Each structure stands twice: as structure tokens, then as C-alpha cells.
């Protein structure tokens, strides 16, 4: 859609892979502020707002805290304490058409600065002078929407760029979107460090003759000590024994 009508998507309760996006190197700009770019794969977020739109090249730098400009002030306002990431990639070879691509429009002027994450449903004509336009143009009356001259022969600074802003919001609600988890081949009959579903420890894993219920994950004996756990990806119930130790 248009940049002033940026497409907003709500994302929750899924695994979000950012390693492929980071290592693709097909995005001109990949800037994450308020979070550690390496730690998105290792952190979970309550909700994700994906704001997708298309702008020109020189306006990419305006998508940052403390920036001033047409897009930041009148189209899409980001807070100074914004917590999220911006991914911008050139689409010249995909958005090039004979005669230019003028489908996308951007808001040029507004009565006041937009509030953060504010969607505009009113298209009031900008009032430059003392006589209100009231939907009638003329002197001191300029339309707030302006086209993009996405000519194939134009410079890179004016070339179209597709920009997706992923805003990670956390509230008094459980985290839903989570990063990818790395699974490593298990080893048996060895005093090894284990990490099952965030439960960490050390021990020796062996086959178990016990019978879990279909929904049960791990079992603990008396004194609140985990003695069995079901390895996923095989659903194998395994007994666990503390590493052999003693006095000398």
C-alpha cells in the first residue's frame, strides 16, 4: 500500500528467524535500535508490529529516533525511545516500469506532527493561508499527497526502496514471538551438561523403563529433583543420574 497507508501486521506466537535476514545481505539497510541485533534470535517478544511501505532512497535515513523530515514528521512518527528494527532494500529491478511507477504516494504536509504509531483516516487539505481550503484548492492551498518519480534512469538516491519496520512491544502479557532455537545431537552414558526446555544442569542420560503420559515432558522424584525427561524430536523418555562423585 501507500507509505501514508503503511501495511500493519500483528505477529505473535511463532518462531521468527532473523539469521537468514541478517545473512542474506540483500537489504541495503538493516538497523535495529533498542535491541541487540545478535540477540533477537535469543530473545522473545510479546508482540511484533510489521509496518511495510515503499519510499525513495534518500528518505531511508529519516526512519530513526530524533530524525526530522517529511516521512518522520507527517507520515510515520517514530518515538525517540523506539525499540525495534528497520529493514530497507532496493526494489529498482522489481518496481521499474515503462513511464515510471507513480502508484505509491507520500504525505507531504500536515497540520501537526503525527503521534507515534498513529494511523490517519482524514485527508484534510493543508491550510497554508488564513482562508481555509475546505476541500477547495487554489491560492494558499496545496494538496498534502505527492507522487514518486520512480524513473528507471533516475539516481540511486531517488530509487524506490521497500522498507519494513518491525517494532517489538512488550506489555503486562507473556512473550509470544520467539527466536530460533539450536538443537544439538544428544550423547548418552557421559557426564555432560544438558539443557532441556530451559532446564539446565549436568548429569548422565540413560534409557528409562518408565512410561510417561502423552502430554508429560519430564518427571521429578521426591525432594524436587528431576530424575527423568522426554527428549523431543524423538519423544524418548530418559532417566538422568548425577555425575559419579565421592570422597577420597
Amino acid at each position, epitope marked *: 500500500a*501507500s507509505v501514508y497507508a503503511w501495511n500493519r501486521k500483528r505477529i505473535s506466537n511463532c518462531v521468527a528467524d532473523y539469521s537468514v535476514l541478517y545473512n542474506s545481505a540483500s537489504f541495503s539497510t538493516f538497523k535495529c535500535y533498542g535491541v541487540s541485533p545478535t540477540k533477537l534470535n535469543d530473545l522473545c517478544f510479546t508482540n511484533v508490529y510489521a509496518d511495510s511501505f515503499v519510499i525513495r532512497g534518500d528518505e531511508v535515513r529519516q526512519i530513526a529516533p530524533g530524525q526530522t523530515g517529511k516521512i518522520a514528521d507527517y507520515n510515520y512518527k517514530l518515538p525517540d525511545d523506539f525499540t525495534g528494527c528497520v529493514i530497507a532494500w532496493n526494489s529498482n529491478n522489481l518496481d521499474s516500469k515503462v513511464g515510471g511507477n*507513480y502508484n505509491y*504516494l507520500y504525505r507531504l504536509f500536515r497540520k501537526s506532527n503525527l503521534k507515534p504509531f498513529e494511523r490517519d483516516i482524514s485527508t484534510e487539505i493543508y491550510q497554508a493561508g488564513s482562508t481555509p481550503c475546505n476541500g477547495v*484548492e487554489g*491560492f494558499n492551498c496545496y494538496f498534502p*499527497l505527492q507522487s514518486y518519480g520512480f524513473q528507471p534512469t533516475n539516481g540511486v*538516491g*531517488y530509487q524506490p526502496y521497500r522498507v519494513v519496520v518491525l517494532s517489538f512491544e512488550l506489555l503486562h502479557a507473556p512473550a509470544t514471538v520467539c527466536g530460533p532455537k539450536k538443537s544439538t545431537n544428544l550423547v548418552k552414558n557421559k557426564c555432560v551438561n544438558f539443557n532441556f526446555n530451559g532446564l539446565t544442569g549436568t548429569g548422565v542420560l540413560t534409557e528409562s523403563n518408565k512410561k510417561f503420559l502423552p502430554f508429560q515432558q519430564f518427571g521429578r522424584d521426591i525432594a524436587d529433583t528431576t530424575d527423568a525427561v522426554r527428549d523431543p524430536q524423538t519423544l524418548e523418555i530418559l532417566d538422568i543420574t548425577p555425575c559419579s562423585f565421592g570422597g577420597v
Partner: nanobody
Framework: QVQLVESGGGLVQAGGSLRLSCAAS????????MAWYRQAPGKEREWVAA????????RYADSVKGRFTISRDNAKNTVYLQMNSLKPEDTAVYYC??????????????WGQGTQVTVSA
């Protein structure tokens, strides 16, 4: 390059019908704003008509509402301007206008040559 042409107009009797055609090549007419102005001899410039690709479909002057229509065709890339119930105030020069934005926040307006319309009572 980009060139625009206005066809139609001339000398016509009162009460007739007129159909102007604005044809622009080098850029599609489906854009932010397409403007049409009237200029009278010895009078100031004033906005008349506009068509937009978002929000309100069309905008007309307050003195021509109800008897004046405009449409566009992107396949053949031409804007038709149909008008009926001619009035003596319509004897003027019609201008077809576009606006564009530069790389350095500079706005350039491409103005049309326009066509003269004369109404005889």
C-alpha cells in the same frame, strides 16, 4: 521526454456541449494530482478542477458543480473533460497541470499550453 497536449475547444454557441482531452506521455496520469485551471483575460489565476488517485475521487469549483464531469483512462492514457449547459463565463483558456517533487525537496509544476474556449450567445 515528458510532453502534454490539450485537444478540443474553439468557438461554440451557447447551450452546447464540450469535450476536452488532456493527453500526457512520458508519465502515467494515475498519480497524486491532476489539475485543470481557467484563465480569463485580465483576471487572476484560480483552481478549477482536480482528480486524485486517493481520498476524494474528484474535486470541482463551486461554480461548475452538477453540470461538469471528468474521467481518466490509463490504458490509452488520456483524461476526458465533459461539460454541458454552456455559460458565458466559460470563455477562457483551459490549462492542464501536473506537479512533481525533486530529489532535493524541490517541487516543479509542469503547466499546459491550454486551449481557448469562446461562447457566443
Amino acid at each position: 521526454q515528458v510532453q502534454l497536449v490539450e485537444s478540443g475547444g474553439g468557438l461554440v454557441q451557447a447551450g452546447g456541449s464540450l469535450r476536452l482531452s488532456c493527453a500526457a506521455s512520458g508519465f502515467p496520469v494515475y498519480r497524486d494530482r491532476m489539475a485543470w485551471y481557467r484563465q480569463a483575460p485580465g483576471k487572476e489565476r484560480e483552481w478549477v478542477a482536480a482528480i486524485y488517485s486517493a481520498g476524494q475521487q474528484t474535486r470541482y469549483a463551486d461554480s461548475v458543480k452538477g453540470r461538469f464531469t471528468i474521467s481518466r483512462d490509463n490504458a490509452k492514457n488520456t483524461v476526458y473533460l465533459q461539460m454541458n449547459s454552456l455559460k458565458p463565463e466559460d470563455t477562457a483558456v483551459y490549462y492542464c497541470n501536473v506537479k512533481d517533487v525533486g530529489h532535493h525537496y524541490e517541487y516543479y509544476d509542469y503547466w499546459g499550453q491550454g486551449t481557448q474556449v469562446t461562447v457566443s450567445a
